[PDB]
């Protein structure tokens, strides 16, 4: 079918990793200013990606930092989050309901790769509001790599998918919508599945959504299918990094 279930919230992750050796490389600066573009190119995208607040305890507190409105307050951001062997900075967007669009953002940089890694969470909730999401997400992909020449690794997934459907369980998964860091032939697999080349990156691949009703064959084809060619090319990576 051409719908899906109907659901008033899916629970989705929303995970970017990248290299951490190149990633480490960078000073609070560089990373402050890579956060900043990022915000930046998530604003046009929906009016729920156009303020990012410091978190707090009252909501007054919680509001009262908008760092798209006052960039050194991202400063503050990795100044209460930073721990001694990381930087870290949360950010939340503003909208306290998950059903409206809200959205907290989480970016690590250690120098290894569990914790080298920009997520948004509960994606699920751009779900619930963007008028045509797969290019909205594709668009969020797009400006990573374009900011974070170090990626190598995207998944935008069910979390119900990702934990109890994957197809390998000690790798990652390429998910609905995801990042693999090389070229892709459209020979290689199913009709459904978009690849989107990006010179001097690789490629994003977006498989069809869950619908209400599919076959055996179409099942398989979706996500993971995908997966079995990339785990078959080498490029699925193990999950243990
Ligand atoms: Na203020």
């Given at each position: ?6 659901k ?8 970017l990793?990248f ?21 930046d190119?998530l ?6 990606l156009?303020n990012?607040?410091?978190?707090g ?6 509001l009262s930092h908008?760092?798209?409105e ?8 990795l ?7 990381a ?6 967007n ?5 059903l409206?669009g ?10 290894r ?5 920009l997520?948004l969470?509960?994606?699920?909730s ?8 797969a ?14 020449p170090?990626?190598?690794w995207?998944?935008l997934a069910?979390?119900?998918?990702f934990?109890?459907?994957?197809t390998?369980?000690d ?5 609905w919508?995801?990042?693999c ?11 459904a599945?978009?690849?989107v ?11 069809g959504?869950e ?5 055996r064959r179409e099942h ?9 060619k990339?785990m078959?090319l080498?490029?699925?990576?193990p999950?243990?990094?």
């Open positions: 079918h051409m719908m899906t279930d109907a008033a919230f899916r629970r989705y992750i929303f995970e990793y290299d951490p050796a190149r990633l480490l490389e960078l000073d609070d600066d560089q990373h402050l200013q890579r956060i900043e573009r990022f915000l190119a604003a046009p995208l929906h009016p729920v156009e990012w607040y410091l978190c305890d009252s909501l007054r507190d919680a908008n760092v798209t006052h960039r050194q307050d991202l400063a503050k951001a100044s209460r989050d930073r721990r001694t062997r930087v870290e900075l949360v950010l939340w503003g909208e306290e309901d998950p409206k809200g959205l907290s953002l989480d970016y690590e940089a250690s120098g790769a569990v914790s080298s890694r997520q969470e509960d994606a699920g751009l779900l619930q509001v963007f008028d045509a999401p290019s909205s997400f594709v668009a969020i992909f797009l400006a990573v790599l374009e900011i974070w170090e990626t190598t995207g998944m069910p979390h119900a998918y934990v109890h459907q994957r390998f369980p790798r990652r998964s390429i998910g919508i995801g990042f860091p090389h070229p892709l032939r459209a020979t290689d697999f199913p009709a599945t978009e690849l080349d990006i010179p001097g990156r690789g490629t994003l691949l977006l498989n959504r619908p209400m009703d599919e076959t398989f084809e979706r996500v993971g299918e995908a997966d079995i990339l078959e080498g490029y699925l990576p999950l243990r990094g």
